[PDB]
Amino acid sequence: MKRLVYISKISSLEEIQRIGKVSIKNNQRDNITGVLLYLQGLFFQILEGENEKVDKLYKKILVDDRHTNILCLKTEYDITDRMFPNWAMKTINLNENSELMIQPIKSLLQTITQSHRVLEKYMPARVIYLINQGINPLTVEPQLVEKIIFFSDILAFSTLTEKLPVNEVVILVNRYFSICTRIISAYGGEVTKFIGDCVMASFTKEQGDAAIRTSLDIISELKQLRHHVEATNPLHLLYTGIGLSYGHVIEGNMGSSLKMDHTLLGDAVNVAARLEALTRQLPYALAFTAGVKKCCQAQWTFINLGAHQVEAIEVYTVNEAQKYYDTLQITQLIRQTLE
Amino acid sequence: MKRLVYISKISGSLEEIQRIGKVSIKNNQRDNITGVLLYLQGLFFQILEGENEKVDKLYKKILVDDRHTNILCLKTEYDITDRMFPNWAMKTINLNENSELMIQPIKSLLQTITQSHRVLEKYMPARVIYLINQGINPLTVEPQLVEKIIFFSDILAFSTLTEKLPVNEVVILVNRYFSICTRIISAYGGEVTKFIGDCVMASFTKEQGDAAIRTSLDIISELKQLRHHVEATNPLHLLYTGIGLSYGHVIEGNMGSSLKMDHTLLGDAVNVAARLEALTRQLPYALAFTAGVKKCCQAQWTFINLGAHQEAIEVYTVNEAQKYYDTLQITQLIRQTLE
Numbered sequence: 146m147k148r149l150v151y152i153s154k155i156s157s158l159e160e161i162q163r164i165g166k167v168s169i170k171n172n173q174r175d176n177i178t179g180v181l182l183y184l185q186g187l188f189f190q191i192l193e194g195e196n197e198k199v200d201k202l203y204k205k206i207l208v209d210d211r212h213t214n215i216l217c218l219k220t221e222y223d224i225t226d227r228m229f230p231n232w233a234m235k236t237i238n239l240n241e242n243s244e245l246m247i248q249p250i251k252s253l254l255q256t257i258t259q260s261h262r263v264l265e266k267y268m269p270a271r272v273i274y275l276i277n278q279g280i281n282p283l284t285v286e287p288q289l290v291e292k293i294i295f296f297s298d299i300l301a302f303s304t305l306t307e308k309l310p311v312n313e314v315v316i317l318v319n320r321y322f323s324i325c326t327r328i329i330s331a332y333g334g335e336v337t338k339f340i341g342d343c344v345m346a347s348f349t350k351e352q353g354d355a356a357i358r359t360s361l362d363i364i365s366e367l368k369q370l371r372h373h374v375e376a377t378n379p380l381h382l383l384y385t386g387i388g389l390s391y392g393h394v395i396e397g398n399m400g401s402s403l404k405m406d407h408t409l410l411g412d413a414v415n416v417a418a419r420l421e422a423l424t425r426q427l428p429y430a431l432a433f434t435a436g437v438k439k440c441c442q443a444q445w446t447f448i449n450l451g452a453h454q455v456e457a458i459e460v461y462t463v464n465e466a467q468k469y470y471d472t473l474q475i476t477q478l479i480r481q482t483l484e
Numbered sequence: 485m486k487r488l489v490y491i492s493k494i495s496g497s498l499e500e501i502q503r504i505g506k507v508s509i510k511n512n513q514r515d516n517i518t519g520v521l522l523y524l525q526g527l528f529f530q531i532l533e534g535e536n537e538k539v540d541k542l543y544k545k546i547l548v549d550d551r552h553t554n555i556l557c558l559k560t561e562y563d564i565t566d567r568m569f570p571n572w573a574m575k576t577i578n579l580n581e582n583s584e585l586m587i588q589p590i591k592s593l594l595q596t597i598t599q600s601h602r603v604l605e606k607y608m609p610a611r612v613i614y615l616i617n618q619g620i621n622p623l624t625v626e627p628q629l630v631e632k633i634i635f636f637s638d639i640l641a642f643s644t645l646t647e648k649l650p651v652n653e654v655v656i657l658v659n660r661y662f663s664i665c666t667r668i669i670s671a672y673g674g675e676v677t678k679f680i681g682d683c684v685m686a687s688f689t690k691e692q693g694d695a696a697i698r699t700s701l702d703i704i705s706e707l708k709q710l711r712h713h714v715e716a717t718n719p720l721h722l723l724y725t726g727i728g729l730s731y732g733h734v735i736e737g738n739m740g741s742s743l744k745m746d747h748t749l750l751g752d753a754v755n756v757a758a759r760l761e762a763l764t765r766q767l768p769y770a771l772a773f774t775a776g777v778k779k780c781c782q783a784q785w786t787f788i789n790l791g792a793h794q795e796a797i798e799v800y801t802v803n804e805a806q807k808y809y810d811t812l813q814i815t816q817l818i819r820q821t822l823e
């Protein structure tokens with residue numbers, strides 16, 4: 146038996162009662178007990194029952210359109226007892242509870258949960274996934290894994306920061322991060338960090354083609370954006386270069402009780418970064434290693450760009466990543482445009 | 485009138501908890517402070533309301549109390565119209581001793597969300613924790629151009645250490661290095677912003693020039709003590725660092741999309757500090773910084789000019805940062821030891 150807890154965000158009061166009625170019916174049939182609280186636009190649900198049976202329900206609740214931003218906070222895998230043996234699904238509306246002695250607990254709960262939701266927006270997606278799976282991020286051991294590492298950043302970003310107002314730079318950076326995160330995630334990748342204007346992400350060794358396609362789609366969407374906007378919009382000057390590496394990296398949660406983070410340790414991270422920087426002096430906006438190339442099964446036109454020093458290593462690209470522009474001219478054009 | 489909420493962990497008894505309750509009633513009666521103290525599973529929740537001078541005066545007293553630790557103020561309300569608890573000088577509730585069944589769901593939800601909250605706090609940038617502690621929602625703060633000293637430190641010959649050490653040995657070594665850097669940076673008023681691979685990124689204000697140099701020297705010194713504290717079979721015996729400091733304008737604030745948010749620092753100084761840390765590999769000093777950092781220093785260091793490096797930039801260090809070893813020889817030692 147196992148018991149899990151999740152919180153969610155509500156997307157009218159009668160419909161909630163309908164939910165509760167359905168749950169009472171469905172859960173008694175499956176020996177599932179639990180509770181549904183709601184307060185100030187948030188849902189709280191505890192569910193317990195047979196391991197297989199709770200999972201089917203949770204999948205239904207996940208795809209349910211009535212709530213969004215679902216996060217499973219805790220899972221307990223071999224519970225000796227149930228917490229609510231008699232409740233198929235007790236609905237408790239903490240909004241219309243006016244009892245004074247419950248008001249401090251209720252107020253603290255709302256404050257702490259809202260604060261928790263704010264913090265969730267800064268978490269690495271890999272930690273959120275771990276928590277959703279019932280794994281303690283603080284105790285899980287890091288592992289060596291084979292990964293494709295993705296690095297991209299904004300062309301001539303120092304020139305742009307030098308010549309643009311604060312809000313313009315932030316709007317531009319936010320648009321860039323938005324387009325990178327959306328495309329990376331669409332292809333199954335995971336964004337690791339933003340470092341300045343750099344986007345760091347990782348794909349699995351089975352996602353070589355997806356990484357190439359992510360890189361091409363980001364470049365392609367930037368080119369569209371550049372001719373979507375007027376020439377007074379800074380977005381008209383947004384270009385990117387992309388580096389990809391493949392290797393062994395130690396993935397996990399690192400640090401101390403004072404400060405934690407999710408990190409990838411290994412040479413491939415630095416190689417991807419150097420390759421991304423190398424695209425400035427290349428006729429292509431995407432550079433990757435032989436290891437990345439070997440993870441690809443599609444019929445790309447790989448182009449060998451010789452050995453370069455980051456030891457020297459072979460550097461490849463695909464034909465479709467070729468620049469329709471000259472890079473040095475572009476940075477000068479950016480400089481002159483901002484005069 | 486001011487109302488604030490905070491949570492804390494108990495350091496290190498029912499009669500002692502009730503003694504806290506009685507002292508608070510007396511003092512709060514004196515200063516027209518009302519509120520609620522709540523205890524649950526080694527955790528403290530307290531709500532305090534009153535006029536500004538008195539609640540701050542009490543809060544400073546509460547921070548220094550040795551009975552609780554890891555104090556975080558979650559919300560602050562200013563010039564409030566009403567009191568939330570007009571009639572309670574200090575109502576102490578021990579939810580551990582509450583056996584009521586109807587309260588058990590809310591009590592369980594509070595414990596779970598608070599414990600998850602404390603875990604999430606560890607992953608936050610120190611600037612976000614700071615903003616929350618000031619009763620400011622970090623998500624509503626607008627980015628600002630500010631003058632910052634940027635700090636970068638990483639592990640020497642880390643590529644060799646990852647290649648030749650087991651995963652668990654690498655993790656113990658990186659955790660200890662992160663543990664040491666975070667403690668010292670934080671002790672000196674610096675803010676750790678994130679870990680990138682084996683690198684620690686932090687920022688200091690322009691008024692903390694000496695504190696940043698002292699932070700760097702202290703980390704180096706503590707690594708030196710540790711290297712001779714341990715046996716030669718311990719990976720910690722081979723742990724060295726290089727440190728880079730830069731000074732310049734950076735944009736600070738929340739950036740990204742609905743898919744991924746983060747606290748980022750945008751600016752030329754971020755890249756410069758990273759390159760200077762890497763530059764220490766080929767210098768007889770473990771610390772390298774720009775001229776702007778040197779101008780932020782009021783203490784009488786022996787600054788040493790290491791010329792210009794790559795537009796070129798001028799590099800400085802302090803005589804105190806000199807290595808008692810040759811760096812190439814130390815790298816060869818690291819590889820020869822691991823055979």
Ligand SMILES: Cc1cc2nc3c(=O)[nH]c(=O)nc-3n(C[C@H](O)[C@H](O)[C@H](O)COP(=O)(O)O)c2cc1C
Nearest residue numbers: 164167168171172188190202205206209211212234
């Ligand atoms: C917040 C929330 C909690 C829910 N909890 C339960 C639950 O505990 N048990 C249950 O059977 N259904 C629950 N539901 C939704 C129903 O599973 C779903 O609407 C219905 O069962 C679909 O019926 P079907 O299986 O015939 O498609 C919940 C929905 C929401 C939005």
Ligand SMILES: Cc1cc2nc3c(=O)[nH]c(=O)nc-3n(C[C@H](O)[C@H](O)[C@H](O)COP(=O)(O)O)c2cc1C
Nearest residue numbers: 504507508511512521528530545546549551552574
């Ligand atoms: C969790 C916790 C909550 C506390 N709350 C209050 C409080 O609300 N009011 C108060 O005067 N002291 C509170 N105290 C303790 C104060 O520091 C107290 O005034 C101190 O222990 C004794 O003060 P005194 O030396 O001036 O007599 C609290 C302590 C703890 C650990």
Ligand SMILES: [Cl-]
Nearest residue numbers: 352353354355
């Ligand atoms: Cl693929």
Ligand SMILES: [Cl-]
Nearest residue numbers: 408409680681
């Ligand atoms: Cl990382």
